[PDB]
Structures are given as C-alpha cells and as structure tokens.
Design a protein around this nucleic acid. Sequence first.
RNA 1: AAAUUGAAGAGUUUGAUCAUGGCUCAGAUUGAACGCUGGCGGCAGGCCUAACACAUGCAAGUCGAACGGUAACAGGUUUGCUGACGAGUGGCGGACGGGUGAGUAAUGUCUGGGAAACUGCCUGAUGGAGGGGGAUAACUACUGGAAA
RNA 2: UUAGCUAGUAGGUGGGGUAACGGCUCACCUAGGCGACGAUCCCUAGCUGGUCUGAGAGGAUGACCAGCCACACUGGAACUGAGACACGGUCCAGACUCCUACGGGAGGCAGCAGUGGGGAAUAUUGCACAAUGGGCGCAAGCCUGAUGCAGCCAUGCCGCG
RNA 3: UACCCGCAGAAGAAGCACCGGCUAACUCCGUGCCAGCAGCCGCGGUAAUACGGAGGGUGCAAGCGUUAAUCGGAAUUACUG
Lengths: 123, 62, 8, 672
Amino acid sequence: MIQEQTMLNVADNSGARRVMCIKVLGGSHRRYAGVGDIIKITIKEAIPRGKVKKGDVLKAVVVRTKKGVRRPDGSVIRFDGNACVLLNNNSEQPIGTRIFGPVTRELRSEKFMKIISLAPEVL
Amino acid sequence: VTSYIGGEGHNLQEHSVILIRGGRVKDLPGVRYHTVRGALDCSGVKDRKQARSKYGVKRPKA
Amino acid sequence: XCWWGXSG
Amino acid sequence: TTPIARYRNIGISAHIDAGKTTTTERILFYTGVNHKSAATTAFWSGMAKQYEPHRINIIDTPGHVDFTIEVERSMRVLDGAVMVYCAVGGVQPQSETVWRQANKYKVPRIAFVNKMDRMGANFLKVVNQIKTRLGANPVPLQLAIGAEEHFTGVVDLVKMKAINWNDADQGVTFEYEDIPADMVELANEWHQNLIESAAEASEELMEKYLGGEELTEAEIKGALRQRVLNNEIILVTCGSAFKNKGVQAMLDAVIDYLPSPVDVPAINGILDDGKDTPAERHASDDEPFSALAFKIATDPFVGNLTFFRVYSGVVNSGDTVLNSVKAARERFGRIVQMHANKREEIKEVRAGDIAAAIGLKDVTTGDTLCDPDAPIILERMEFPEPVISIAVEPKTKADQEKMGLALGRLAKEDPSFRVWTDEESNQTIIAGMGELHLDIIVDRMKREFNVEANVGKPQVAYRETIRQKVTDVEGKHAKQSGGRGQYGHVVIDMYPLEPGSNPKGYEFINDIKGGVIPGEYIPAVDKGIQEQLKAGPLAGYPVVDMGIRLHFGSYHDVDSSELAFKLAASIAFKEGFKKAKPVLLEPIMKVEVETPEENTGDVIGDLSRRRGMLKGQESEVTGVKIHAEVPLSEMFGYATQLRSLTKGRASYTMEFLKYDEAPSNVAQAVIE
RNA sequence: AAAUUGAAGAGUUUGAUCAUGGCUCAGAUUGAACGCUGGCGGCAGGCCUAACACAUGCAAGUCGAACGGUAACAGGUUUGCUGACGAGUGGCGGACGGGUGAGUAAUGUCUGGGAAACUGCCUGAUGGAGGGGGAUAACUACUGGAAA
RNA sequence: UUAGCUAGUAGGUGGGGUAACGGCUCACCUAGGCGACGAUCCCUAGCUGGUCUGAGAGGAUGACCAGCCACACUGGAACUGAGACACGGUCCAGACUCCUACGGGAGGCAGCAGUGGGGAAUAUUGCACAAUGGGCGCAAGCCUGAUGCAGCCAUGCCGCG
RNA sequence: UACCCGCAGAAGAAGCACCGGCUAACUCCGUGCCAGCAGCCGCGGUAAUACGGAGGGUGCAAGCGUUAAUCGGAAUUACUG
Ligand SMILES: Nc1nc2c(ncn2[C@@H]2O[C@H](COP(=O)(O)OP(=O)(O)O)[C@@H](O)[C@H]2O)c(=O)[nH]1
Ligand SMILES: [Mg+2]
Ligand SMILES: [Mg+2]
Ligand SMILES: [Mg+2]
Ligand SMILES: [Mg+2]
Ligand SMILES: [Mg+2]
Ligand SMILES: [Mg+2]
Ligand SMILES: [Mg+2]
Ligand SMILES: [Mg+2]
Ligand SMILES: [Mg+2]
Ligand SMILES: [Mg+2]
Ligand SMILES: [Mg+2]
Ligand SMILES: [Mg+2]
Ligand SMILES: [Mg+2]
Ligand SMILES: [Mg+2]
Ligand SMILES: [Mg+2]
C-alpha cells in the first residue's frame, strides 16, 4: 500500500538509492499503489555518476511491498521493504539494466517482461 | 584559450572544429596560440603561392 | 537565414 | 572461384505499406528452404529446382519520398527491379515516383501485385492502372484464380496451368492443375495477349505467329526476356505474401525474365581525369576493376561497412584501389557478404556481385573505386536537392560539440541530408528530402548517438533600407578639455539609393568644394559611414540600397584627426537614419512549382495564403509550372503543405531574388 | 701500443656609454605531431592518452613405452587382434614464455654483505625396490534440464 | 603553510607457528620504540643497467633491449603443487555485459591480430614452426600470436637514383 | 629469395623553406598603419630587399618547414663556478 510521501528503496541499477512517491497514477482520488502499479516519484538519494540524479521526477513500478500480495488460494507473499524499479517518464521502460531482489508474478505482463527476465528470483 | 587565425581569409565561424599550435602574437596581449590553417574546419589562404605549407595550400596544378 | 541554397 | 555470372541483382521498390518487407522476408524463407534497408544475398533454383541455383542480390528500397536517396542508389547499382503494387491501392503516389527513378537508369522491371486476399482487390484493375497512369505496357504472366476472400492461388498464363500452393506447408510445395472453366474464358484471351507481345520483340516470331504456327514456350519466354531488357514492356504477377501464395512463383519469373550482370549495358565513365574520355568499362573480370560505393554504414563491433558494386574486374584483400572522385589512394581488406542467416568473410569479389568492404577509410557515398593502374571515374549517383530546412539547437550547451560531429556523421552516410551554419544567426540548419526524413535523423542523433536537440524554424536575414531623403544632417564630435582633443564636424545628406544602381548598394559622394574638409579626412568620414551600415540603428540588421553625400564640414589645426571625423560621421549617420523613414526588408525568393493540373488551384491558393505574389504560370505536357515571389519567412516547411495538397506529386525550386520590404505586422514582429 | 686530447658567441634597456639583469637566437636530440611534397632499397621503431569497454579467431598442451577400454580409421556378422587412439583415469607442464606499469618513496630497486632456510626437472654417490588391501573414472542401465 | 608519532606499539619470557629466523602469533612481564641526521602526514613515482645533452661537473630521462619488482574486471580468500594465494585455475562478494525455452546459465584482450572510445598521434582479424628456444614424449612427433618472417607507415637513421 | 645476366629506352622519378638585421641570399609590382608579417628587434600611412605576388638568388633535399619537449649556450641556483 504505497501512498504519496512513501519512501521506497530502488530495485534497479539506475543509481537511485531512495525515491518518494509524489503521485499514485491511474485514477482520480486513487489512494494506494500495489505491486505492478506505476507511480510518479522524485529521486531523494542517488549514487554519484548514476543514470539518474537527485531531484529528478520520473515514473516507477512497485515490485516489492511490505503489505504484500494475495495469491488466488488466499496465500500472502510479503516483503520486509517497499521497493520500485525506475521507468523512463515517456516510454515507461526500465532505466537500469539489472534487477536486485525477488519480484512477484504480478509483474508478468507484457510491459514488464524486461523486469521479470532480469530479476534474481521471481516468487 | 585565444588563438590567432593567420592569412588573408578566415572561414572560422561559431562551433568550428580547428587545431591550435604554439606561437605568441607580440602585438596581441594574451594570444599565445596560432590556428593551424589547412587542418580540420580551418582552410588555406586563397591564391597563396609562397609559404603555402605554413598556410596549408596545395601545390598549384602547374 | 532559410534553406540549403544559403541566401537570408 | 567464380559463379557463371547468372546472379540476378534486383531491388524491391513499391509504395509504403505495399508489402516490400513482407515479400523480401518470404523471398529469404523460400530461398533458405531451397538451401538444405540493407543488401542481402540468397540462392534460388526453380520451384521445381528446374533452374540452376542462382545468387539473388535483393535490396528492399524504402517507399517514402523522404528516403528517395536510397531508391536512387539502389536502382543504379541493381541490374533488375521488382515493383510491388498493393491490389487495393494499385499505383499509389510513391509507386509513380519509383517508376520514374527506374526510368532514369533504364532498369528492366517486373510487377508483383500483393494483397490479393484483401477485400475489394482486383488484379486486372491494377494492370489497367499500370497501363494508364504509368503509361507502360503490362503483360499478365500470371492471372489469379481466386479473388479477395476466395483467393486460393495464382494461375500461370504461359503454361496455361493453375498453380495451387500448400497452406499447411506455408507455400513450400507447388502444384499444377487445370484452369477452372469459369476462370479459363478470361485466361485464353490474356494468354493470346502474352503470345502477341512475345512475337513483336523477335520480329522472326511475329511473321511466324501471323502465318498461324503456335509459338514455343522456349520461344515466348525468350522474346519476353528480350523485351524486358529493351524496357518496352513490364510483366505482371499476383500473390499474397501473407497467405503465402504466389511469392514463390514470382521469384522463378524474376530469374527467367530479368537481366544478368552481363545483360545490362556497361557502366559509362570518364577514363582517368580530364578530356572527358569515355571509360567504356565492359562488365567482365578481364576488364580493369571498376566499383561504386552505395549505402555506407557503421557497426560497433566491426569497422565502417561500405557496400560496393563491382561492375568489372575482381578485388581481393591486400589490393590497392584508387578513389577517383576523392583522389584518395585506398586498399581493400576484410570484405563481407551478408546472407540472410549470417555475414561471412570473403577473400575476393567477382564482377557483377555486391559486398561490403569493412574499414574503407576514405570512401563516402558516390565514390568510384578502381585499380590505380588504368584509373576510371564512373559518374556519381544522382543526389536530390533538399526540400525542407529546420534549425537544430542542442538542449545542453555541452552537446553542441557532440551534435556537430553527429550531424556530420549522418551527413556522411546519407547524401540527401545536409548540415550548415548560417553566418548571420550562427545557428545549425539541417536540410532533408522530407519532414519525416529530418525527424528520423533527429531521433537517430538521440537514440543512436547520445545527443537530444530542439527543432526550430531558421532565423531569416532581415535587411534595413531608407525611404525618403533627409538633407542637412550635421554631426559634430568635440572632446576638447585640455591637452589634445578630437574635433570633427561633418554635414551629410542621407538619401535612399535605388536597389539596382550599384553592386554594393552604397554610394558615398565627395561633394566637398573648397577647403571646408581636408582631403585626408574624407576617407575617414567614408569609413565611419560604412561601419554604421554594418549594424543598423533600428533592429541591428545590415543597411542596404542607401547612399550619402558629404557637402560641408569643419576642422581644427591640432584637434582634427581621422578618428574624430569617423565618429562625427557615425553621429550624423544615426541622426539621419532616425529621421529618414527606416523600413526592414524581408528576403523574397523566386519559387517555381511543378504541380498536377487538378491541384493548381490549391497550390496557387496556398501561395496566396502566404504573403507571396504570383508572377507567372506555364501549362506543360507533364504538370503545370507556377512562378511566385514569396518571402523566405513564409517559405517554411512549404514542402509538407505542398505534398498534402498534391498527394506528394508536386516539387518546387527556389532562388533568392531581392529584398522587398516586409508588411508592417511582420516588420514590427521582426523589430520585437 | 689505442681507448673522451676538452670549453666560442650574437640580438634587444641609452642620445651615446659602462655595468647589472632578464628575454631571445645559432647546436644537438625525440616512441613525435601537423602542413606541403614524395622514386627506391637496407636496418630499426610504431596507443606516449582511457589499468577505458571489448564482437570474433587463435595464444598450453602432450604422453598408448602408466592404465582399463576401443568411439573412429586402416589392415588381418565379428573382435582389441595389430597399427593407431576419441572420451576417461594417471603423470607432467600449465608458477615458463607473453602483456602492462595501476599500485609502490621503500615492505620495491641498486650496491655490498649476511644467517636461520628450501629447492620439480638435471647431476654424482650408496643402497633398496619385499608382499598385500580397498576403491573409483570411463562403462552399462535408468532419469532430469533449453542449455550449462 | 605536515612536529610530534606509536600500543603488538618496543623489548623480554614461555607456548604455538613457518621450509627457515623473527610480535610471525598468543599469554604474562617491563615501559619502551621512532623523530629537526625530518618521524608522522600530504603529493608524486615502477627501480636499474642505460638513454639524451653537457669540455666536465651536472641537468633531464627511464620508449625500445636486458635485469629486478608489481599487477592481471574490482575487493577478499584459500586449494593443488617443488614452486602460485595463480593472465587464458578455484570459491565468495561487487560493478558490468551476454545466452535462455524465463527454470536458470556464462564471461573477463594490461596474450596476438582486431573493433569502438578517448586523443595532435601510433600498424595486419597476414604466414610458418623452416631455424633458434620452451612444454610433453624413449623417440618419431605434437603443441608454441615465444620466435622467425611478411603487410602497413618518409617515423628515424643510412645508402642510392 | 639475395644475387647475377639479357632486353628496351632518357625513358618512369624534386620538392620544401627562406633573402631587414641577428643569419647564407635583391629587385620590381600591387598595397598605403589597411591587408597582412613577426623567434627577437621590429615592418606597413606612396621609391616596402620586412606585407601579397612575379623574376633572381640562397639553404636543405625524398624530404622541407612549423609546433611541442629535453639539455646546452645560461657563470641565468655558480660543487666545479
Ligand atoms: N492481407 C495482406 N496483408 C499483407 C500482405 N503483405 C503484407 N501485408 C501487410 O502489410 C503491412 C505492411 O507491409 P510491409 O511489408 O511493412 O510493407 P512496406 O512498408 O512496403 O515494407 C504488414 O503489416 C503486413 O501484415 C498480403 O499479401 N496480404
Ligand atoms: Mg519495412
Ligand atoms: Mg492504404
Ligand atoms: Mg599504456
Ligand atoms: Mg607505476
Ligand atoms: Mg603511477
Ligand atoms: Mg656548462
Ligand atoms: Mg600445498
Ligand atoms: Mg594460468
Ligand atoms: Mg587473458
Ligand atoms: Mg591486442
Ligand atoms: Mg577521436
Ligand atoms: Mg593449441
Ligand atoms: Mg646578409
Ligand atoms: Mg619568388
Ligand atoms: Mg648551468
């Protein structure tokens, strides 16, 4: 359940270390972003010489959430942190070339086959 | 830095890729470099038949 | 300033 | 190591969306099944493997008028041509242009009608359109048994047998069967037309046919080859590159009806340099090596790839070459030929074949590569003049150095794309054959090179002129406060000179009489006035068509100096310009437009919508010529609007004519 | 016997002078570059920058006289029977040769010493080399993975 | 325009450890040790035989050839072996890139050739083990981008037209 | 392959800098503090051996100039001195 002001760790190698959701996209009065939801973000921390710089505003896809996801059998998969993969503002494609940490089959859509194929573990 | 274009005609404009070599222009304070003519964007002096190598002018077809 | 034939 | 020079060099040319990429993909599939953009080599026997497997050099040429440059180079280099026509579209605007490019190089061509399966598609209609719009003779080698939804295959007129392809095998297996009786009633008449055309070319077969003896298949096929080489006729076949029916047969027709490298006329050129002696290089290995460079490209893991066509002679690795056009000595190594599956190193390239020489350091597009001994200069390929120009300014100041390198690299690979820096605005202006062409170069500069840029409209070079004459303009410059001061007094008359009176457009009159102004100071006054023209008082634009008269003045024995008189002249010039009526001038272009008669009203109206004034109109056998005088500021992206009005069938040329004054609304806009 | 038998000045501060004092020039050199030009041979040299990133081919294998076996080839439906040896076990090499100068102001290098050591292959000497045990690759059968 | 630095630090005793000596390591004991003959810290740097220049002293330099040192994507660690904490070995971690059927896999040109990039600037994806070496083998042989050559280049010297 | 022999025929093969002094080598024409030149001094505003060109000369030569860099001259860090 990611809302505006939520800080998320970055799962890619774009160079952003921490990001803040500034808007949950996809609806008017939309409140929460879960796994697989695109959110506008601002880089609050970035490594030097990275592909992204502190203050940049761009889209991101939420890949791991502490609230977790629900499976059709009632199973719940939860993580110990909220993490996102930064996406180009226009093409909604991943800025980085590597994905760190597990991801959920919730991202197995056509837009996110890149992320799925690069994740170390998909559960 | 500042460089001196030498010869009667210069084609240099803005954003011109050129090659610079040492050489101070006594009467110009701060100009300690000379543009090389005949190199990259910079061209050779037109109708030059003496010291053509210094000004990068090809041998006349004569 | 305005076309390949040079000119304004 | 030589194939018997039975390779079929061909180029796929058609209107956009016609099927050029689908057809070529199917060509690679069928030739590849027979075995156990960019140039490609395949191997094609017959469908029944009747023909000896021949190398097929296939290039899919781009349909867009924006990318016409590639069609030009392809038609010249490629001996044969295959024109794809959409069955619903028939002869669309671009397909009309590609015909003319083939006409320029006299390239023998056959026609494949694609999209037979599509609804409302008629094979005969497209043949009728080919005869009426392109003014050419179309002969149906193959008729189509099925139409639209009921399209099931393509019938063969020469054998008078229906061909059924296998839907399950993806068209891999051909079948031969009787023509349905409903289809046959039409087939007989078309087969008679095929026979009639073959007889005309041979003349010997013509008398035999008139007597009444049936022409041989061996003899009809021969005569049809004869006439395609003559360029008198075109051969039409129909197929669906999606339903996988018909493409296979068209290839066998290409091999049996198109020219070999030997069949085409030998390339013409200037032997050595000077005297314009005809090179007359015959296309054969024995004659001195001759080649031309087309479609140069760059690879990250390979050296620059320079695609070349060897007309005569054989080139090898470690072989010296001469760039006749650039006067540059060259050497050849690492040649590669690209098959559909892979690219392979080849030690030698026989005449009549195309390959890509990796690492050719001095070879741009349109360069003639020949042996240093016995040099030959084949002419450079036709390069079209750009039709639209836009200003490119880098989004970041740092990108300016990178952008210039990037646009130059794009300009080296593509002849049509041009780059320059206008002296007035010092802006980078790019020129291209279409709006889309410029857009793709911009995207490449961003996607390929790391340089994003801002598109803009070029800044027009405004001029200033004077209306009305102001007399008795006096300018006194005095700086005397102790020691040596500078004193100069000049009385001048600023008048508007006529536009055509003198080449400079400026006249200085030494009307001084007596010793009022010493002769030595008059040149300094003239120098100050010329300097003022360089930066106009109102808007900073250069002054033009203006002359002045110096009639009186004053001096001092110690104070007067050349510099003092120049500054006094500058003061007087400004005062006179302020009172004389200063008007900005807008450059006017003489524009000539060739338009189809139907759209002449639309083009004339568009020119009238612009502040342009029509000065002429010539009706022509092909098109209607319109002459108009239009300010260059109004002439921006004119090609886009002109193409929208005329279905991209109209071309325009322009030349700077004169600097007529701008309208007040535009002139005030320029001042701001 | 012979094996450094080796050291040059000039221009420019002044109206002129002398001193001081810089600046500049004449010489040699270079992993050079550039501009113009270019017949040839011999010999040498050739990323000085990003120890930047590297597509591809190759740069370390060999031994059947260690051993089971013989895939395959060649001879005398078949075999290890032979030549010869794929794969495998075993031995040896792979620490050499080749590249580069990032690090390193001394833990390195050079100069001269030392004392408390090791050392395949090579070499000289003196002997021995006795007699057994268990296992395992390849292999066969089965089975998993797109491949590894 | 770096004055203090050090606590296994400095030494002793015992144990362990290494092929070997040794705070090498550990326990205890003592309170040492270095430093204006510049310790510590900071910047820079492979070192040498030599080279260039200078009458010489000296100054500059360390490309090529030979000796030595160090390094092998980055950081760490061991294994085997006489010998490596190993360029084309292993394990881990990190950055990066590639293959995939999406389950997982793979790699390291500062070898030679070669490409992009940077730069004023620097070469062929050549041939052969014939010679000289090296590895293996009884040898024959095989392997050898060592080496021998060949290409490119007025880059230098030298000779000639 | 080096090398040697036979053939044909002057045939296939010269450029680059410089000339005020320092520093070897001079006049004319254009130009008129402009355009340019320049290592240093300095030249050019109407007879410019200093600029641009022509003729003539000079230096070197398959090279010749220019820039960069090192040492010398610099006793201009002087141990010699
Ligand atoms: N129905 C039908 N569609 C076709 C056929 N050939 C090509 N197309 C479609 O036409 C579209 C454009 O074809 P393309 O090869 O891109 O044409 P190009 O732009 O001339 O290269 C493709 O998406 C094809 O699906 C055909 O024979 N039948
Ligand atoms: Mg296409
Ligand atoms: Mg359409
Ligand atoms: Mg290096
Ligand atoms: Mg170092
Ligand atoms: Mg270093
Ligand atoms: Mg001395
Ligand atoms: Mg061990
Ligand atoms: Mg190794
Ligand atoms: Mg390696
Ligand atoms: Mg290499
Ligand atoms: Mg570069
Ligand atoms: Mg090998
Ligand atoms: Mg003299
Ligand atoms: Mg002369
Ligand atoms: Mg000295």
